[PDB]
Amino acid sequence: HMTEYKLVVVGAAGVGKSALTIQLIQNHFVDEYDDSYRKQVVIDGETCLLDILDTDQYMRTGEGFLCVFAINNTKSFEDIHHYREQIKRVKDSEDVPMVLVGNKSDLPSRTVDTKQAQDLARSYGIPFIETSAKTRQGVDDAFYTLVREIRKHKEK
Ligand SMILES: Nc1nc2c(ncn2[C@@H]2O[C@@H](COP(=O)(O)OP(=O)(O)NP(=O)(O)O)[C@@H](O)[C@@H]2O)c(=O)[nH]1
Ligand SMILES: [Mg+2]
């Protein structure tokens, strides 16, 4: 009675992968942290069980990927290329469900502009969503959009 979606969250250290996952799950912002999580949620009339790995037999079996950088961490943005190449390598495909997420939108120290990010996402043929795990802006959007990209890609 529920559709399972296996989602994987990837990106450089400190970008807020856990904090995003934890917002989605417990609607709380964790300043201080350090596996798999489940969330049941209705998306467009379908009861979904999200199976989320916050980072292989999850890399190879993942159905969709959130590729996260922080908008105040130019390196993390530059690293996205590597993570996308990694995902492509495991799946012999240039069409893997994926969303580029620019996190920490609440912070003032912004070194990656919305147009760099938009340009990168356009080149890959994927959505870009800006988030803050702190304020919760964009978080549901990012996960719901990923679910929708998986459905666009294959029957579920
Ligand atoms: N203002 C603000 N701060 C944020 C936001 N999101 C996270 N933070 C902050 O950075 C955290 C570090 O993020 P984590 O979730 O642990 O990062 P991971 O990518 O999981 N690292 P790893 O497990 O690969 O080592 C933490 O100091 C603080 O909560 C956000 O949106 N805004
Ligand atoms: Mg983490």
Q: How was this structure determined?
A: X-ray
Resolution in A: 2.0
Type of residue numbered 106: D
Pairwise CA distance, residues 16 & 104, whole Å: 8
Q: How many residues does the chain have?
A: 156
Atom of ligand 1 nearest to the CA of 105: 31
The residue whose CB lies within 8 Å of the most ligand 1 atoms, and thus the one to mutate among 28, 104, 106, 136, is 104
Of the CA atoms within 13 Å of residue 15, those in its CB half-sphere come to: 30
Cβ atoms of 55 and 10 closer than 8 Å? yes
23 lines ligand 1 (CB under 6 A): no
Q: Exposed/middle/buried for 140, CB within 10 Å: 0-12, 13-18, 19+? A: middle
139 lines ligand 1 (CB under 6 A): no
21 lines ligand 1 (CB under 6 A): no
**Which domains, and CATH codes, for the chain?**
1-156 (3.40.50.300)
If we measure between CA atoms, which residue out of 40, 41, 17, 39 comes closest to residue 30?
Answer: 17
